Design a protein around this ligand. Structure first.
Ligand code: NA
Lengths: 416, 143
């Protein structure tokens, strides 16, 4: 008909748009391109139970052809925690991001079949009775959260099984934090009850960052999290030995990390901890989003924060925060899609040429706005200030149960 | 750049209207070479036209045929669907966006010609059947 861009092979239909006046169809094209941009750039990822939601995250962003996914090809590692053992892998988000791995959940007694199938797909496991030692699985939790039969069945599939466990919640947490590593002289410290506090900090903690705080998805390193006994006067000798020379950022109020603990960390690190805390978890999350060096100074492009995530808080059951666990590795890497060679690719999978398409410039990480039933005004101010003039381009909802009232208010700040 | 693929400047014809296209090709006599591609695989350089006929006759869901005359032309197996935006019961621009994924760049340069910023030298806005019309192809269904 006309000299235009030729269509795709898999085009479902050929739309012919007709109108008596050219201004009418000009308006329709304007309306179409606007709502096409919004619907393509606002997505929810969730599952039925805590296990399936972790599976859903892995399917979309790991070993998938989806654009804006983290990895186009299969992965090698997988992080596994107990089902309701939120406390046996609460600090595992930086580990999953560092290991380029998804974070999945399992029952205590028996390895769930859905998990078994998920491990095969994301890892491209060919046979379950051969040997797959090129693939590693990390078990976060003791024998009373992930029992022996689960680890035995996991080895029956020829999988490497590494257990990170201690005699309690605090010891096991130090095993996971030490696995992540203190590779930037910077850490996050929460209390024995600050479960929501560690979820607010997980997405930025999972960011693969340069020493200059810049974005680097090929060499960057994450930041670990430690949960300590906040209902005490001093801090444990194990916690002291881990936090050495570190610029510790306490996330949480004095009821979970007491002033005695804060001064103990000051006495154990030589630097005054930078406390980021409001009166509740939502106010603490707002200060995290608002921080310039958290989501703004990391960028290599001329633009400001563009992409955003959102997950539940534990105001009701304290076990919903597991969804923010699995989302944190993804949000920290949003912005560019990399193949198994670490190169930025398009929708069709072809590499991008030119210095303008540097994967460190195209990447733009996303905070997790912690909100289950309402969005705090302090969060709204932060999101607006960190946004770029040209407006936002992505919003990802993680898990079931987040009110849409939070979702569309976000879309107004990002102007999608 | 002498190859037909998505986004290339040229002409696009649905597999149901291929005969009238290829008929304007034989009468051409080079306006006085016609290269034919079967799903990007070679079929004819230029009866053979009946061989091309049969391929377009039994095209499948993910199958497509390309042509090259200075001019490019692709023929694919999409269904035909016309929406009169001046009519009720039609899908809104939102409902069309919720179901289909559209190319943003093509929608941009289409608007610019419509707004008057560009002279319609390539007849993107066509005065046909008494109305003003444009052709739009999605890139897939929204999952
Ligand atoms: Na590390």
């Amino acid at each position: 008909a006309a000299k235009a861009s030729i269509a795709d092979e898999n085009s479902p239909v050929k739309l012919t748009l007709k109108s008596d006046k050219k201004k009418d169809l000009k308006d329709y094209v304007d309306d179409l391109r606007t709502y096409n941009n919004g619907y393509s750039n606002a997505i929810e990822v969730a599952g039925e139970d805590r296990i399936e939601t972790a599976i859903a995250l892995s399917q979309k962003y790991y070993n998938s052809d989806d654009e804006n996914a983290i990895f186009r090809d299969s992965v090698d590692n997988v992080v596994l925690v107990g089902g309701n053992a939120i406390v046996d892998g609460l600090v595992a988000s930086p580990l999953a991001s560092e290991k380029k791995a998804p974070l999945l959940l399992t029952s205590k007694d028996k390895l769930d079949s859905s998990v078994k199938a998920e491990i095969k797909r994301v890892m491209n496991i060919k046979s379950t009775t051969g040997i797959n030692t090129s693939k590693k699985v990390y078990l976060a939790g003791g024998v009373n959260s992930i029992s022996k039969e689960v680890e035995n069945e996991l080895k029956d599939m020829g999988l490497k099984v590494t257990r990170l466990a201690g005699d309690d919640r605090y010891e096991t947490s130090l095993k996971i934090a030490d696995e992540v590593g203190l590779d930037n002289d910077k850490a996050f410290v929460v209390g024995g009850t600050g479960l929501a506090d560690a979820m607010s900090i997980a997405p930025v903690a999972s960011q693969l960052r340069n020493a200059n705080g810049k974005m680097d998805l090929a060499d960057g390193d994450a930041t670990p999290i430690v949960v300590v006994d906040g209902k005490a006067k001093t801090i444990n000798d194990d916690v002291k030995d881990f936090l050495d020379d570190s610029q510790v950022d306490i996330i949480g109020g004095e009821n979970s990390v007491s002033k005695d603990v804060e001064n103990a960390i000051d006495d154990a690190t030589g630097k005054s901890p930078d406390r980021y805390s409001g009166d509740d978890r939502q106010a603490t999350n707002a200060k995290v989003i608002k921080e310039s060096s958290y989501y703004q100074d990391n960028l290599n492009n001329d633009k400001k924060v563009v992409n955003f995530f959102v997950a539940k808080d534990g105001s009701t059951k304290e076990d919903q925060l597991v969804d923010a666990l699995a989302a944190a590795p993804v949000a920290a890497n949003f912005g560019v899609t990399l193949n198994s060679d670490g190169k930025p690719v398009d929708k069709d999978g072809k590499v991008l040429t030119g210095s303008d398409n540097d994967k460190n410039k195209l990447v733009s990480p996303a905070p997790i706005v912690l909100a289950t039933d309402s969005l705090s005004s302090d969060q709204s101010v932060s999101i607006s200030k960190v946004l770029d003039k040209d407006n936002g381009e992505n919003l990802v909802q993680v898990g079931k149960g987040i009110a849409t009232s939070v979702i569309n208010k976000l879309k107004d700040l990002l102007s999608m | 750049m002498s190859k037909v693929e998505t986004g290339d400047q040229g002409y696009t014809v649905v597999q149901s209207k291929y005969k009238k296209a290829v008929e304007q090709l034989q009468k051409g006599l080079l306006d006085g070479e016609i290269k034919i591609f079967f799903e990007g695989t070679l079929a004819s350089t230029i009866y053979c036209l009946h061989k091309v006929d049969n391929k377009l006759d039994n095209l499948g869901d993910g199958d497509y045929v390309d042509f090259l005359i200075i001019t490019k032309l692709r023929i694919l197996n999409a269904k035909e669907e016309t929406i009169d935006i001046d009519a009720s019961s039609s899908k809104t621009a939102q409902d069309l966006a919720k179901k289909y994924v559209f190319n943003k760049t093509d929608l941009n340069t289409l608007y610019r010609v419509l707004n008057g910023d560009e002279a319609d030298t390539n007849r993107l806005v066509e005065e046909v059947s008494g109305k003003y019309q444009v052709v739009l192809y999605p890139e897939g269904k929204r999952v």
